[PDB]
Amino acid sequence: YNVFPRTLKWSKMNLTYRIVNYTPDMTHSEVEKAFKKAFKVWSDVTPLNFTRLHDGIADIMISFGIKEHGDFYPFDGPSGLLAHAFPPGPNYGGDAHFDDDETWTSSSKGYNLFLVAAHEFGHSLGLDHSKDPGALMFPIYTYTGKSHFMLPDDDVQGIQSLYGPGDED
């Protein structure tokens, strides 16, 4: 027999993702680069592996949409809500949605896609919000301006409490 796990998390280390569509704001290459880097933020500190699928059903379906887009969390036009992701689970579990009424960038203008994505994927993996103002999972977008990204310890401890550290070096 089997009882449901104690925490909401993926029961497999090999996960797949699919970029269903693209925002008008960035080139396909820019968007792909941003998401790949965001997944690496988490794979670098756990035993998780992320493989991209170009079609079909992936564990983490990524898409850009506006207003009502297929769930109980419609977006609200420019400003306000910017994106959200569902926690680990069947069907839409793990999926990540980005509000395409926002401005997405690979720089410091508007919302940095990589940064927001890293945050959303945290939710896709089982992390909720943190009270640490400097955490990636803090609820409010707080771009620091630094050039090098380094996952805050609060986030490291959180994700490892779910999946372990993987190779520590």
Ligand X SMILES: O=C(NCc1cccnc1)c1cc(C(=O)NCc2cccnc2)ncn1
Rounded-to-integer distance, Cα 127 and Cα 137, Å: 8
The answer to whether residues 119 and 136 touch, using CB atoms and an 8 Å cutoff, is yes
The dihedral region occupied by 166, where left means phi > 0, alpha psi between -120 and 50, and beta the remainder, is left
Q: Which is nearer to Zn ion, 47 or 73 (CB)?
A: 73
Q: Please state the closest distance from residue 3 (CB atom) to ligand X, in A.
A: 17
Residue whose structure tokens are 């079609």:
55
Q: Which two tokens stand for residue 42?
A: 């988490």
Q: Which is nearer to ligand X, 22 or 138 (CB)?
A: 138
Q: Please state the closest distance from residue 13 (CB atom) to ligand X, in A.
A: 25
Question: Under the rule (CB under 5 A), what is the footprint of Ca ion?
Answer: 76, 80-81, 94-95, 99
- Contact residues: a second copy, CB under 8 A: 1-9, 70-73, 87-88, 90-92, 126-132, 135, 137, 154-155, 157-158, 161-162
